[PDB]
Design a protein around this ligand. Structure first.
Ligand SMILES: Nc1ncnc2c1ncn2[C@@H]1O[C@H](COP(=O)(O)OP(=O)(O)CP(=O)(O)O)[C@@H](O)[C@H]1O
Ligand SMILES: [Mg+2]
Ligand SMILES: [Mg+2]
Ligand SMILES: [Mg+2]
Ligand SMILES: [Mg+2]
Length: 441
C-alpha cells in the first residue's frame, strides 16, 4: 500500500490543492514561551494568528508538525510500549483556517480525504465521530450533510469534571486559543478490546482517535474566562502514525513501515531476537524524540527541557540493557532513523554527527552506574514487603546512579511494584535544603 512518507505527502497535497499554504514544521522548542516544555501540537506556531494578533498572507495552511508529548499538559511517556497509538515523538498532520472556512467545510475536507475513492478511500462504516454536547451545528453537519448514521455520532459534554473540560473541547493551555471540537475515530475490529468514545472502555485500542478538528472560537483567559476570538477559525490535527496504521491495515502504530524498519534496526544493534516487545518499541520511539530534540537544540542536562531529554535517553538505554545490549547502541540508531523519516528527517541529517556524539556521550556516562544500579534495585525488590518501593531507595538510585524516578518506576512497573514518588520528592527536597544550609545561599 502507501508508505508513511506517501501518506504524509498525500495529506499535504490534498490541502495544497484545496488552496492551502504549505508551511514547514516549527521546532520542538517553543519560541520564547516556557511554560510549555515542547511543541505538542501543529497549531502552536499559528497561536497568535488564531488570537488575531498576527496575520499571514494566506488565510489557510497545512503542516506536518513534529510534536513531543513527554511533559505537561500532554504526557504520553508512560503509554509508550503499552498502547498501540501513543508516542512521545509523532507527526501531527494539520489543516488550518485563519478566519476562512469554518465548521461545514472543515468537516467536508476531512471526510473527503478519508473516504473518497480519489483519496484515502476508507469505508464509511468503520468511522465514528464525536461532537461537543452543545455543538448542535457540528451534529447536524455530520448527520444531514455528511450522512453519518446517528448511532456513530456521539455527543460528549464536560466529562473531565469541570466546565469546558472535555474530550471535545480542545485547549492549548491554561490560556490561549481554544474551542469545541469534533473527532474522528476508526474501528480496528472486534478482535481488539475496547469500546467507542464515551464508553467505560473507550481507552481500548479498538476505537482509535485519528483526527481532531478544532473549531477555534475562544481565547481562554487566566481567570478561566472565555473571550471570543475576532474570527472563528479551524485547527485540525491527525496523527500521521495512526492514519498510516489504518491505511496499511494494522492496529498498531508500531506495525507501520516506519516502525517496522526502525524496530529491526534496534534489534540489530542490541542483539534482540524477539519480533516485538516493550523494550524494542520503546527504544524505537525514544530515538525519535531524543534525536529530534537534540537536532532542535536541546542538550541533556539536569533541569527543565534538558532533563526531560536526559530522562528519555536513559530510559531507552535501560531498555537496551533489558534486550541484552553489550556495547553502546543508542547513537547507532540516528542513521536508520534519518532513513525512515525521509523529508521529515532532513533537519536531523543536517546535524547527524552532532546528535550522534551527544547520544554516545550520554549513554557512556549513564553506563558507568546502570548495571550496578540495576543490581541494587533487584536486591531491594527481593526484600520488599508490600507493593511500593520506598523513596529512600529511589533517591539512592538517583543520587548515586543517576536513575530518574520515572526510570526506576518503569522497571518496578514491569514487576507490578509501585514507587513512592512522594517520598522521593521529599528526599529530594531534604537534599536541596542541606545544600541551602551548607552553602548559605
Ligand atoms: N502521544 C501521541 N502519539 C501519537 N499520536 C498522537 C499523540 N497524541 C495525539 N496524537 C494525535 O494527534 C491528534 C490531535 O491531537 P490531540 O491533542 O487531539 O490528541 P488526543 O490526546 O486527543 C488523542 P488520545 O485522546 O488518544 O490521547 C490526535 O487525533 C492523535 O491522532
Ligand atoms: Mg491524549
Ligand atoms: Mg480526544
Ligand atoms: Mg482523545
Ligand atoms: Mg483529542
Amino acid at each position: 500500500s502507501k508508505s508513511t512518507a506517501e501518506i504524509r505527502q498525500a495529506f499535504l497535497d490534498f490541502f495544497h490543492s484545496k488552496g492551502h499554504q504549505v508551511v514547514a514544521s516549527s521546532s520542538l522548542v517553543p519560541h520564547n514561551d516556557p511554560t510549555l516544555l515542547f511543541t505538542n501540537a501543529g497549531m502552536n506556531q499559528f497561536k497568535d494568528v488564531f488570537l488575531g494578533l498576527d496575520k499571514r498572507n494566506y488565510s489557510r495552511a497545512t503542516t506536518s508538525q513534529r510534536c513531543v508529548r513527554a511533559g505537561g499538559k500532554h504526557n504520553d511517556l508512560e503509554n509508550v510500549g503499552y498502547t498501540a497509538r501513543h508516542h512521545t515523538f509523532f507527526e501531527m498532520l494539520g489543516n488550518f483556517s485563519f478566519g476562512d472556512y469554518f465548521k461545514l467545510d472543515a468537516i467536508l475536507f476531512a471526510w473527503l480525504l478519508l473516504t473518497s475513492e480519489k483519496w484515502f478511500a476508507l469505508p464509511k462504516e468503520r468511522l465514528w465521530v464525536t461532537v461537543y454536547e452543545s455543538d448542535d451545528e457540528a451534529y447536524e453537519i455530520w448527520e444531514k450533510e455528511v450522512g453519518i448514521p446517528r448511532e456513530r455520532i456521539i455527543r460528549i459534554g464536560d466529562n473531565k469534571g469541570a466546565p469546558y473540560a472535555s474530550d471535545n473541547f480542545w485547549q492549548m493551555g491554561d490560556t490561549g486559543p481554544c474551542g469545541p471540537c469534533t473527532e474522528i475515530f476508526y474501528d480496528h475490529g472486534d478482535h481488539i478490546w475496547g469500546g467507542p468514545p464515551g464508553s467505560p472502555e473507550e481507552d481500548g485500542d479498538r476505537y482509535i482517535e485519528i483526527w481532531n478538528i478544532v473549531f477555534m472560537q475562544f481565547n481562554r483567559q487566566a481567570d478561566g474566562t472565555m473571550e471570543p476570538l475576532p474570527k472563528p477559525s479551524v485547527d485540525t490535527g491527525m496523527g500521521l502514525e495512526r492514519i498510516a496504521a489504518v491505511l496499511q491495515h494494522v492496529n498498531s502504530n508500531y506495525d507501520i513501515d516506519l516502525f517496522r524498519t526502525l524496530i529491526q534496526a534496534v534489534a540489530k544493534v542490541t542483539g534482540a531476537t524477539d519480533l516485538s516487545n516493550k523494550s524494542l518499541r520503546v527504544i524505537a520511539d525514544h530515538i525519535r524524540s531524543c534525536a529530534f530534540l537534540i537536532a532542535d537544540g536541546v542538550m541533556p542536562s539536569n533541569e527543565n527541557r534538558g532533563y526531560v531529554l536526559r530522562r528519555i535517553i536513559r530510559r531507552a538505554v535501560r531498555h537496551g540493557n533489558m534486550l541484552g545490549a553489550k556495547e553502546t547502541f543508542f547513537y547507532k540508531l540516528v542513521g536508520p532513523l534519518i532513513d525512515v523519516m525521509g523529508s521529515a528527517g532532513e533537519d536531523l541529517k543536517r546535524q547527524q554527527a552532532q546528535v550522534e556524539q551527544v547520544l554516545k556521550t550520554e549513554e557512556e556516562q549513564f553506563a558507568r552506574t546502570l548495571e550496578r544500579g540495576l543490581a541494587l534495585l533487584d536486591e531491594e525488590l527481593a526484600k520488599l514487603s508490600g507493593d511500593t518501593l520506598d523513596g529512600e531507595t529511589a533517591f539512592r538510585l538517583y543520587d548515586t546512579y543517576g536513575f530518574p524516578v520515572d526510570l526506576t518506576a518503569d522497571v518496578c512497573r514491569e514487576r507490578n511494584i509501585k514507587v513512592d514518588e512522594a517520598g522521593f520528592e521529599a528526599a529530594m527536597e531534604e537534599q536541596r535544603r542541606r545544600a541551602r544550609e551548607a552553602s548559605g545561599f
